[PDB]
Amino acid sequence: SELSERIESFVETLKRGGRSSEEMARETLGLLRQIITDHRWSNAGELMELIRREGRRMTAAQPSETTVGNMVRRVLKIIREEYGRLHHYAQLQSNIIEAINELLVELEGTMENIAAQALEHIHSNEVIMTIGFSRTVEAFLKEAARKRKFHVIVAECAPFCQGHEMAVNLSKAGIETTVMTDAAIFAVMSRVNKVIIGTKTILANGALRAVTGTHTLALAAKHHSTPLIVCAPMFKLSPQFPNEEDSFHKFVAPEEVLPFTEGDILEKVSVHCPVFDYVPPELITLFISNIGGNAPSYIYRLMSELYHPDDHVL
Amino acid sequence: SELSERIESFVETLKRGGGPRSSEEMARETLGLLRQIITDHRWSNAGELMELIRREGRRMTAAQPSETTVGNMVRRVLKIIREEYGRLHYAQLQSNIIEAINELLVELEGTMENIAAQALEHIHSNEVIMTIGFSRTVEAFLKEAARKRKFHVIVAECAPFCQGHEMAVNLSKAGIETTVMTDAAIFAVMSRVNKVIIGTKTILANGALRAVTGTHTLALAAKHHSTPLIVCAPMFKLSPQFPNEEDSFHKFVAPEEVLPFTEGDILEKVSVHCPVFDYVPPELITLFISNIGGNAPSYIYRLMSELYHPDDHVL
């Protein structure tokens, strides 16, 4: 069928890596909406087994891409809460759809509601320092740049120099930007007033898996007591704790770090190149969500009203 | 004699009130008195000369134990006597000490210009400095960096003697973008402050520091935000005393500065204290900008050995 082929198309795109995180969540919702429409299912139990199986294969496709797993769990919570309030229900197939639509308009407004709180956290003559290239943080820095005037230091992330296109994006909007070399984070930390970063994933204890320089960044921010603000919406909120059994690191080709033209020493040197870096929650100051700016120590509560505890493990 | 009445005039103005305003004038008057003691009392050798200076410095220290700039320059003259009698080991010794004392005095009166010379190395344009009380050395440190760069100094006036008022006017007259605040806001505006430059009453022998009250709070606020706490203080403010619990550290002025006498009957039930000096441990200090450099707190002990003999620590 069209839907099945689109499911393995999504899974193989996840495996190979061929988009932003908000587009990832939007495509996941579109896929799961299709799954609950076009498949035949009698009651909610079979559909939860189906959604669980497909979420298991999309999660096992790329386990470090947790936006798809989060949106699978959000849809599962929606299914078991739109079936709870009706407790084979005929209108249930419609009801979940509407909630999914109410989720999809909760999305596409996540970046605006995070950007609305920019002026409350960025002041005139401020110096902000960021790391990766996250669309949430650039909209945050481009909504605060409409009124106030500040300096932003975009420390590039070294293997995939992606703070380059961030500082190109920010300098087009008139923010006076500085590109760093990622070795100077402790050097320029004395000047920096706030650190605003984005995440790949917010783990359930308030810790976060982010771009590979963010822990080396957060240690400097904690050393100089600079507040580390984290701009990240509620699809990036994953209910997984940082256990050693599950691997959260992603490792890419060493050609990003040590090129293939080095030659014979590549048979002896072990080059690694991870792309994600665990930041423990005691180095964090705030999470600017789409629903506010609450502390890391509140994140567990945001788990309980987003994901059911039976849906943590799929 | 004129000398003797000048000795108890100095001792009485040390117990009771002021006299020399700044610590540099206090040390210069102390060398004047010590040089006069060398010249005018009769002594045969350096033994009873050391005993005489030791007991005079003992009474000048027991006059006001929290005024250590007097007690240091007694010990520097004792070290000078021991090192100008060592190189002759008499007759000409009475001259030699005087010459060294003169070389000490011109070592003074240029302590402030050698601390102010290091201003540009530690103060940068568009920075922001925080100071607690009126220090002559810190003010001249901020003056020398002002004529080349452009910064903004926050002077947290140290209540009850609102003496950061008299500094934030001195800094405002020289065009530094100064700001005086209540000093209950030390932690509040600490987040935006780049450096803290303070002065001392005394640098204790472990790099610890005795400053005007509210400095230890200032130091803790600086350590919280990891703001470097620079300390501008010359070598007469360097005393070879570790923070004993035996001898008295604080000085306690009248409670009228804190709670006025017009409060009425509640003054019979309320214990008001008003200390003027605060102990800052050396782990909150970053630098000691002396007149000889900018060395770390963990070098201060070595500066003791080059300045005061170990036998002269306790008088």
XYZ file of C-alpha atoms in Angstrom:
629
model
C 0.000 0.000 0.000
C 0.916 3.684 -0.165
C 0.995 3.953 3.626
C 3.178 0.900 4.232
C 5.739 1.991 1.641
C 5.705 5.428 3.255
C 6.389 3.797 6.651
C 9.525 2.015 5.458
C 10.451 5.153 3.505
C 10.371 7.067 6.790
C 12.268 4.313 8.609
C 14.999 4.144 5.968
C 15.275 7.939 5.883
C 15.747 7.771 9.654
C 18.450 5.107 9.303
C 20.403 6.867 6.555
C 19.813 10.333 7.997
C 18.260 12.192 5.067
C 15.293 18.059 8.098
C 14.680 20.047 11.260
C 13.338 18.561 14.480
C 9.963 20.278 14.168
C 9.622 18.822 10.670
C 10.576 15.447 12.159
C 7.749 15.703 14.684
C 5.280 16.965 12.072
C 6.097 14.078 9.730
C 5.837 11.638 12.635
C 2.375 12.977 13.470
C 1.322 12.760 9.831
C 2.551 9.176 9.648
C 0.861 8.150 12.896
C -2.361 9.866 11.857
C -2.221 7.819 8.659
C -1.517 4.644 10.670
C -4.548 5.116 12.898
C -6.789 6.014 9.951
C -6.006 3.544 7.192
C -5.277 0.387 9.184
C -8.272 -1.616 10.335
C -8.528 -2.068 14.096
C -11.466 -3.036 16.266
C -10.741 -1.362 19.599
C -7.997 0.782 21.089
C -5.917 -2.156 22.330
C -4.984 -3.477 18.889
C -4.198 0.044 17.719
C -1.955 0.664 20.717
C -0.104 -2.567 19.923
C 0.190 -1.412 16.298
C 1.395 2.094 17.205
C 3.784 0.543 19.726
C 5.262 -1.827 17.131
C 5.712 0.885 14.504
C 7.177 3.242 17.085
C 9.531 0.458 18.124
C 10.805 0.044 14.578
C 11.105 3.806 13.996
C 12.938 4.160 17.306
C 15.227 1.195 16.629
C 15.922 2.705 13.203
C 17.728 5.705 14.727
C 17.689 5.506 18.542
C 19.411 8.867 18.890
C 16.545 10.611 17.066
C 14.079 10.706 19.927
C 11.622 13.229 18.508
C 9.928 10.390 16.631
C 9.814 8.258 19.786
C 8.413 11.162 21.791
C 5.667 11.766 19.288
C 4.836 8.054 19.221
C 4.457 8.207 23.001
C 2.393 11.408 22.812
C 0.036 9.766 20.350
C -0.167 6.717 22.638
C -1.096 8.946 25.586
C -3.685 10.683 23.390
C -5.123 7.284 22.425
C -5.406 6.087 25.998
C -6.867 9.399 27.201
C -9.433 9.729 24.398
C -10.457 6.136 25.074
C -10.513 6.681 28.824
C -13.037 9.502 28.560
C -15.237 7.207 26.461
C -14.994 4.513 29.147
C -15.039 -0.797 20.163
C -16.078 2.859 20.099
C -17.132 4.264 16.741
C -16.251 7.930 17.275
C -12.899 7.091 18.903
C -11.246 6.917 15.476
C -12.436 10.473 14.930
C -11.663 11.670 18.458
C -7.957 10.786 18.433
C -7.689 12.478 15.026
C -8.953 15.753 16.458
C -6.529 15.518 19.365
C -3.759 14.797 16.868
C -4.871 17.873 14.949
C -4.856 19.766 18.237
C -1.331 18.433 18.653
C -0.380 19.544 15.147
C -1.535 23.071 15.953
C 0.300 22.758 19.249
C 3.184 22.190 16.875
C 3.860 24.925 14.295
C 3.392 27.357 17.195
C 6.091 25.920 19.420
C 8.737 28.196 17.939
C 6.556 31.298 18.242
C 5.719 30.686 21.907
C 9.389 30.148 22.729
C 10.328 33.275 20.790
C 7.687 35.308 22.636
C 9.664 34.899 25.874
C 12.822 36.310 24.297
C 12.470 39.830 25.668
C 12.029 38.547 29.227
C 15.459 36.878 29.079
C 17.562 39.100 26.785
C 18.445 42.680 27.678
C 20.211 45.559 25.973
C 24.016 45.409 25.739
C 23.868 41.714 26.614
C 26.326 39.147 25.348
C 24.847 35.713 24.658
C 26.778 32.646 23.605
C 25.328 29.679 21.742
C 26.852 26.561 20.235
C 25.078 24.636 17.491
C 22.579 25.729 14.911
C 19.109 25.262 16.352
C 16.080 26.877 14.756
C 14.539 27.438 18.182
C 17.454 29.497 19.479
C 17.806 31.574 16.318
C 14.116 32.504 16.450
C 14.632 33.300 20.131
C 17.581 35.558 19.302
C 15.729 37.093 16.348
C 12.658 38.005 18.374
C 14.775 39.682 21.042
C 16.720 41.482 18.305
C 13.621 43.303 17.073
C 13.508 45.478 20.188
C 16.819 45.228 22.002
C 20.432 45.255 20.834
C 22.939 42.666 22.007
C 26.006 40.643 21.095
C 25.903 36.935 20.291
C 28.922 34.651 20.179
C 28.241 31.543 18.082
C 30.896 29.026 19.046
C 31.046 26.666 16.071
C 30.733 22.942 16.722
C 33.979 21.576 15.393
C 33.312 18.404 13.271
C 30.264 19.717 11.392
C 30.953 23.431 11.543
C 27.302 24.346 11.886
C 27.611 27.445 14.013
C 28.906 29.009 10.801
C 25.473 28.984 9.188
C 23.980 30.023 12.528
C 26.163 33.120 12.682
C 25.443 33.784 9.022
C 21.724 33.539 9.831
C 22.065 35.810 12.859
C 24.273 38.407 11.165
C 21.697 38.797 8.396
C 19.203 39.837 11.082
C 21.571 42.490 12.404
C 22.774 40.811 15.596
C 26.455 41.580 15.992
C 27.889 38.076 16.017
C 31.231 36.450 16.722
C 32.280 33.054 15.433
C 34.524 31.085 17.754
C 36.626 27.993 17.303
C 35.083 25.780 20.104
C 38.436 25.798 21.898
C 37.796 29.273 23.273
C 34.657 28.529 25.297
C 36.485 28.857 28.602
C 38.388 31.850 27.244
C 35.456 34.079 26.269
C 33.297 32.779 29.119
C 34.296 35.664 31.394
C 32.582 38.181 29.124
C 29.477 36.110 28.352
C 26.357 37.010 30.329
C 23.906 34.245 29.344
C 24.261 30.983 27.440
C 21.289 30.002 25.303
C 21.515 26.568 23.695
C 19.237 24.052 22.034
C 18.935 20.324 22.560
C 18.410 17.139 20.665
C 16.587 15.657 23.655
C 15.657 16.608 27.207
C 15.961 13.499 29.322
C 13.561 12.778 32.137
C 15.790 14.039 34.960
C 16.245 17.456 33.397
C 19.504 16.409 31.780
C 19.844 16.875 28.072
C 21.530 15.240 25.105
C 22.759 18.057 22.913
C 25.379 18.993 20.297
C 28.796 17.626 21.150
C 30.211 20.797 22.676
C 27.410 21.598 25.107
C 28.802 19.790 28.146
C 32.183 21.448 27.684
C 30.101 24.646 27.397
C 27.964 23.979 30.458
C 30.995 23.263 32.617
C 32.409 26.677 31.697
C 29.017 28.284 32.310
C 28.794 26.655 35.733
C 32.387 27.663 36.466
C 31.713 31.337 35.743
C 28.142 30.943 37.125
C 26.704 32.116 33.823
C 23.041 31.057 33.525
C 22.591 28.323 30.923
C 19.200 28.865 29.336
C 17.893 26.017 27.178
C 15.305 26.807 24.505
C 13.580 23.553 23.670
C 9.934 22.666 22.998
C 7.869 19.721 24.244
C 8.541 17.300 21.440
C 12.185 17.295 22.558
C 11.136 16.018 25.986
C 11.879 12.371 26.188
C 10.830 10.174 29.124
C 14.074 8.198 29.119
C 16.455 8.470 32.045
C 20.210 8.435 31.359
C 20.693 4.726 31.958
C 23.817 2.875 30.880
C 21.830 0.057 29.259
C 20.452 2.231 26.474
C 23.107 3.949 24.359
C 22.349 7.611 23.765
C 25.568 8.524 21.964
C 25.638 8.671 18.184
C 28.949 8.159 16.407
C 29.491 9.246 12.815
C 32.281 8.639 10.324
C 35.786 9.650 11.469
C 36.247 11.410 8.118
C 34.520 14.364 9.789
C 37.400 14.539 12.298
C 40.474 12.921 10.741
C 40.296 12.859 6.931
C 41.000 9.776 4.852
C 44.008 11.468 3.228
C 46.092 10.949 6.383
C 47.126 7.542 5.086
C 48.983 4.810 6.946
C 48.529 6.270 10.437
C 44.809 5.623 10.007
C 45.480 1.928 10.545
C 46.826 2.649 14.042
C 44.890 5.710 15.210
C 41.405 5.153 16.624
C 39.284 8.189 15.701
C 35.790 8.399 17.156
C 33.742 11.580 16.417
C 30.625 11.524 18.611
C 27.951 14.089 17.840
C 26.024 14.215 21.119
C 27.148 15.154 24.602
C 25.374 14.538 27.895
C 24.747 17.629 30.008
C 23.703 16.803 33.588
C 20.816 18.857 34.989
C 22.804 20.638 37.700
C 24.566 22.704 35.026
C 21.230 23.943 33.633
C 19.394 27.062 34.769
C 16.133 27.186 32.782
C 14.104 25.404 30.139
C 12.270 27.945 28.019
C 9.482 25.680 26.808
C 6.510 26.622 24.686
C 4.503 26.672 27.938
C 6.779 28.806 30.067
C 10.272 28.912 31.482
C 10.251 26.340 34.267
C 13.268 24.909 36.071
C 14.962 21.561 35.323
C 13.628 20.176 38.608
C 10.080 20.421 37.199
C 10.716 18.266 34.123
C 9.540 15.038 35.773
C 6.098 16.599 36.205
C 6.046 17.508 32.530
C 6.646 13.819 31.869
C 3.609 12.724 33.832
C 1.194 14.938 31.911
C 2.724 14.148 28.499
C 3.533 10.419 28.525
C 1.826 7.628 30.414
C 4.279 5.603 32.542
C 3.358 2.450 30.638
C 4.528 4.150 27.421
C 8.061 4.924 28.594
C 9.625 1.685 27.345
C 7.248 1.163 24.375
C 61.845 65.968 75.673
C 60.116 66.859 72.413
C 60.422 63.259 71.213
C 58.770 61.716 74.263
C 55.749 64.006 74.218
C 55.514 63.356 70.479
C 55.498 59.595 71.204
C 52.562 59.782 73.587
C 50.891 62.342 71.325
C 51.033 59.743 68.551
C 49.888 56.984 70.918
C 46.985 59.065 72.242
C 45.824 60.157 68.795
C 46.085 56.493 67.808
C 43.878 55.276 70.684
C 41.358 58.086 70.702
C 40.821 59.473 67.231
C 42.605 59.743 63.923
C 45.399 62.088 62.971
C 46.820 60.512 59.827
C 43.863 59.962 57.514
C 45.275 57.474 55.022
C 47.426 54.457 55.799
C 50.290 55.908 53.763
C 50.414 58.956 56.040
C 50.135 56.631 59.042
C 53.166 54.661 57.880
C 55.083 57.830 57.018
C 54.439 59.247 60.491
C 55.467 55.895 61.956
C 58.799 56.026 60.108
C 59.219 59.637 61.195
C 58.731 58.607 64.808
C 60.986 55.547 64.503
C 63.725 57.581 62.813
C 63.446 60.144 65.592
C 63.724 57.345 68.189
C 66.884 56.102 66.437
C 68.438 59.562 66.348
C 67.588 61.022 69.737
C 67.623 58.261 72.357
C 71.091 57.146 73.320
C 71.865 53.492 72.666
C 75.206 51.750 72.473
C 74.588 48.735 70.251
C 71.604 47.374 68.344
C 70.506 45.130 71.217
C 68.894 47.668 73.523
C 67.948 49.625 70.400
C 65.842 46.654 69.305
C 64.459 46.368 72.843
C 63.530 50.068 72.879
C 61.873 49.958 69.461
C 60.181 46.681 70.387
C 58.597 48.097 73.532
C 57.626 51.373 71.843
C 55.974 49.426 69.042
C 54.371 47.219 71.674
C 52.714 50.229 73.278
C 51.855 51.698 69.855
C 50.248 48.385 68.905
C 48.379 47.968 72.191
C 47.233 51.559 71.655
C 45.125 50.429 68.681
C 45.589 46.748 67.801
C 43.506 47.026 64.645
C 45.826 49.682 63.176
C 48.462 47.295 61.888
C 50.165 49.792 59.575
C 51.819 51.121 62.714
C 52.831 47.636 63.822
C 54.266 46.659 60.450
C 56.574 49.638 60.170
C 57.899 48.877 63.636
C 58.813 45.429 62.334
C 60.344 46.801 59.137
C 62.638 49.019 61.201
C 63.511 45.983 63.322
C 64.362 43.997 60.181
C 66.354 46.977 58.887
C 68.300 47.111 62.154
C 68.966 43.373 62.019
C 70.115 43.542 58.389
C 72.251 46.680 58.791
C 73.870 45.219 61.898
C 74.353 41.890 60.155
C 76.410 43.372 57.331
C 78.622 45.092 59.910
C 79.071 41.799 61.778
C 79.379 49.864 66.482
C 79.604 53.513 65.443
C 78.286 54.135 61.918
C 75.306 51.790 62.381
C 73.252 54.729 63.679
C 73.815 56.385 60.314
C 73.220 53.257 58.234
C 69.770 52.466 59.644
C 68.723 56.074 59.021
C 69.813 55.783 55.400
C 67.871 52.547 55.020
C 64.898 54.209 56.701
C 65.163 57.007 54.152
C 65.298 54.362 51.436
C 62.180 52.941 53.059
C 60.488 56.345 53.052
C 61.157 56.859 49.351
C 59.994 53.273 49.021
C 56.872 54.852 50.450
C 55.426 57.980 48.801
C 55.711 56.044 45.510
C 53.724 53.010 46.573
C 50.600 54.501 45.027
C 52.245 55.420 41.717
C 53.581 51.866 41.335
C 50.146 50.348 41.975
C 48.457 52.839 39.678
C 50.973 52.011 36.942
C 49.548 48.482 36.779
C 46.010 49.745 36.190
C 45.966 49.337 32.421
C 47.053 45.701 32.627
C 44.001 44.845 34.744
C 41.307 47.304 33.585
C 39.887 47.230 30.070
C 37.568 49.467 28.098
C 33.820 48.881 28.529
C 34.419 46.811 31.666
C 32.727 47.285 35.016
C 34.459 47.364 38.397
C 33.040 47.104 41.899
C 34.627 48.750 44.941
C 33.396 48.701 48.523
C 34.953 51.579 50.455
C 37.026 54.665 49.907
C 40.579 53.472 49.321
C 43.257 55.943 48.297
C 45.168 53.213 46.467
C 42.129 51.840 44.639
C 40.938 55.327 43.706
C 44.329 56.210 42.214
C 44.289 52.780 40.574
C 40.963 53.698 38.988
C 42.246 57.175 38.093
C 45.225 55.898 36.100
C 43.103 53.451 34.126
C 40.535 56.198 33.519
C 42.769 58.486 31.479
C 43.275 55.824 28.793
C 40.199 53.580 28.855
C 36.468 53.876 29.484
C 34.755 51.823 32.185
C 32.010 52.015 34.784
C 32.657 51.595 38.496
C 30.026 50.474 41.009
C 30.895 51.749 44.494
C 28.840 49.841 47.065
C 28.886 52.325 49.940
C 29.847 50.570 53.164
C 27.204 51.388 55.741
C 27.127 52.846 58.446
C 30.013 55.191 57.602
C 28.739 55.889 54.093
C 32.294 56.284 52.848
C 31.595 54.986 49.378
C 29.790 58.289 48.957
C 33.093 60.149 49.229
C 34.630 57.815 46.648
C 31.822 57.856 44.077
C 32.165 61.637 44.086
C 35.946 61.424 43.683
C 35.499 59.009 40.789
C 32.708 61.087 39.249
C 34.936 64.170 39.246
C 37.381 62.323 36.980
C 34.741 61.168 34.512
C 34.533 57.508 35.504
C 30.945 56.382 34.931
C 30.507 55.661 38.611
C 27.445 54.282 40.407
C 26.915 54.247 44.161
C 24.488 51.679 45.555
C 23.141 50.797 48.949
C 25.496 47.700 49.427
C 22.497 45.557 50.179
C 22.637 45.087 46.404
C 26.112 43.542 46.226
C 24.814 40.130 45.153
C 22.082 41.606 42.978
C 24.254 43.555 40.542
C 27.160 41.115 40.892
C 26.000 39.166 37.844
C 26.951 42.003 35.498
C 30.266 42.914 37.174
C 33.554 41.958 35.516
C 36.119 42.649 38.264
C 36.133 43.617 41.923
C 38.924 45.924 43.014
C 39.081 46.517 46.762
C 41.469 47.868 49.354
C 42.573 46.463 52.677
C 43.236 47.536 56.175
C 45.627 44.601 56.555
C 46.837 41.624 54.543
C 47.324 38.786 56.981
C 50.165 36.334 56.657
C 48.253 33.600 54.802
C 46.981 35.906 52.099
C 43.863 36.475 54.173
C 42.586 39.977 54.398
C 41.051 42.411 56.878
C 38.943 44.946 55.055
C 36.068 47.301 55.718
C 32.864 45.571 56.709
C 30.857 44.054 53.899
C 33.963 42.974 52.000
C 33.656 39.314 52.987
C 30.094 39.444 51.726
C 31.476 41.106 48.596
C 34.133 38.416 48.301
C 31.565 35.631 48.656
C 29.395 37.271 46.003
C 32.430 37.536 43.724
C 33.359 33.901 44.312
C 29.774 32.864 43.588
C 29.794 34.477 40.138
C 33.535 33.661 39.788
C 34.306 37.345 39.360
C 38.033 37.949 39.979
C 38.609 39.852 43.215
C 41.638 42.057 42.673
C 43.169 43.590 45.799
C 45.198 46.796 45.540
C 47.324 47.090 48.652
C 50.963 48.093 49.205
C 53.545 46.450 51.467
C 52.948 48.464 54.594
C 49.505 46.835 54.739
C 51.158 43.414 54.972
C 51.291 42.138 58.505
C 52.994 38.940 59.673
C 50.002 37.856 61.752
C 48.015 34.745 60.986
C 44.301 34.853 61.867
C 44.636 33.795 65.491
C 41.628 33.360 67.706
C 43.813 34.628 70.550
C 44.351 38.286 69.702
C 41.405 40.518 68.858
C 40.699 40.874 65.140
C 37.699 43.180 64.854
C 37.233 46.794 65.864
C 33.835 47.757 67.271
C 32.829 51.416 67.039
C 29.858 52.945 68.848
C 26.385 51.590 67.992
C 25.210 55.156 67.324
C 26.469 54.659 63.767
C 24.060 51.735 63.302
C 21.142 52.346 65.669
C 20.833 56.002 66.720
C 20.426 57.093 70.322
C 17.025 58.610 69.510
C 15.459 55.135 69.326
C 14.516 55.413 72.985
C 13.695 52.657 75.446
C 14.285 49.707 73.098
C 17.998 50.478 73.353
C 17.993 48.956 76.829
C 16.913 45.579 75.425
C 18.616 45.502 72.009
C 22.291 44.616 71.613
C 23.698 46.634 68.696
C 27.260 45.877 67.658
C 28.657 47.685 64.553
C 31.973 46.063 63.598
C 34.088 47.918 61.063
C 36.372 45.149 59.803
C 35.567 41.926 58.000
C 37.754 38.873 57.530
C 38.210 37.686 53.954
C 39.838 34.251 53.654
C 42.494 33.920 50.939
C 40.497 31.496 48.795
C 38.183 34.355 47.796
C 41.132 36.548 46.729
C 42.455 36.353 43.185
C 45.305 38.883 42.994
C 47.330 41.183 45.217
C 48.390 44.173 43.142
C 51.295 45.308 45.296
C 53.801 48.019 44.502
C 56.154 45.261 43.294
C 53.858 43.329 41.002
C 50.558 41.503 40.934
C 51.385 38.249 42.684
C 48.925 35.648 43.940
C 47.704 35.188 47.538
C 49.656 31.943 47.742
C 52.870 33.976 47.500
C 52.103 36.367 50.371
C 53.994 34.271 52.950
C 57.206 34.687 50.960
C 56.740 38.445 51.034
C 56.726 38.073 54.813
C 60.172 36.508 54.873
C 61.675 39.290 52.769
C 60.064 41.974 54.951
C 59.906 40.840 58.592
C 62.268 38.639 60.548
C 60.576 35.645 62.227
C 61.641 36.852 65.674
C 59.863 40.178 65.074
C 56.449 38.693 64.310
C 55.193 38.851 67.902
C 57.259 41.919 68.947
